[PDB]
A = this chain, B = another copy of it.
Amino acid sequence: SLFELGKMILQETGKNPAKSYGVYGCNCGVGGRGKPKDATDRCCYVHKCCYKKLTGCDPKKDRYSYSWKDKTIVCGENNSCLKELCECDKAVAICLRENLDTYNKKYRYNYLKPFCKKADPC
Contacts and interface: CB of A to CB of B under 8 A. Distances in A.
A61 B46 CA distance: 25
A74 interface: no
A92 B111 CA distance: 18
Q: Which of A18, A31, A111 has the largest count of B CB atoms less than 10 A from its CB?
A: A111
Interface stretch (A49-57, A63-71, A75-83, A112-120): A112-120
Contacts of A2: 114-115
Nearest to A17: B111
15 contacts: A2-B114, A18-B111, A18-B114, A18-B115, A19-B111, A22-B111, A22-B112, A22-B114, A23-B23, A29-B113, A29-B114, A30-B113, A31-B31, A109-B109, A109-B111
